[PDB]
Design a protein around this ligand. Sequence first.
Ligand SMILES: NC(=O)c1ccc[n+]([C@@H]2O[C@H](COP(=O)([O-])OP(=O)(O)OC[C@H]3O[C@@H](n4cnc5c(N)ncnc54)[C@H](OP(=O)(O)O)[C@@H]3O)[C@@H](O)[C@H]2O)c1
Ligand SMILES: CCc1nc(N)nc(N)c1C#C[C@H](C)c1cc(OC)cc(-c2ccncc2)c1
Length: 159
Amino acid sequence: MISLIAALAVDRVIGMENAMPWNLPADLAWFKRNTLNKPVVMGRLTWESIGRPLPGRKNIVISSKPGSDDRVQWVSSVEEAIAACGDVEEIMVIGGGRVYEQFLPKAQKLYLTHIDAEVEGDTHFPDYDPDEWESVFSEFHDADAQNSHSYCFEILERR
Ligand SMILES: NC(=O)c1ccc[n+]([C@@H]2O[C@H](COP(=O)([O-])OP(=O)(O)OC[C@H]3O[C@@H](n4cnc5c(N)ncnc54)[C@H](OP(=O)(O)O)[C@@H]3O)[C@@H](O)[C@H]2O)c1
Ligand SMILES: CCc1nc(N)nc(N)c1C#C[C@H](C)c1cc(OC)cc(-c2ccncc2)c1
């Protein structure tokens, strides 16, 4: 099964100047919890935004250049990227925007972190039709010491 996991600011902003315009440890924990023991897939600039694989996970990145790296599996499209996962129950897509867009029709579940902050960004999460998803899980958290802005964790499923 395919799923997308993302942190969304106000009006769906996900990134600015090859980075994320916030720092939330709670959402980091949520990310780590739901991406654990699952394979992850990302685009080039995101991989380059990290530069180091996720521990004990099968890391897959999508591109049009030769693998500049041997510690990760390189793929050039969507359907063979799924075949690059094998016989798995759940596949994780962690970004970014164009990957989100291409896999959103493929995705059957959405792990969304709703960040309550309006901030600046060049990249957005694909507009999904709220007609197409329903919320099975909603967990709201106000901002605190470690968390600069409030946030709400949500799990969506297709219909
Ligand atoms: N808040 C969040 O949840 C979060 C999480 C992750 C990332 N982000 C942010 O979002 C931004 C990244 O998103 P993005 O839209 O810029 O890029 P992206 O989707 O992560 O990466 C796209 C890259 O992957 C390659 N690619 C994608 N599909 C391909 C295909 N079908 N065939 C061949 N290559 C393909 C493309 O290069 P080529 O096609 O030329 O090879 C392209 O350069 C970053 O700024 C990051 O900081 C935010
Ligand atoms: C807030 C992070 C985050 N939060 C939520 N709720 N969803 C997400 N999808 C992401 C994210 C992300 C990006 C794609 C990412 C890619 C990556 O590709 C290797 C490694 C990491 C990462 C390696 C180690 N420690 C922290 C993050 C993050």
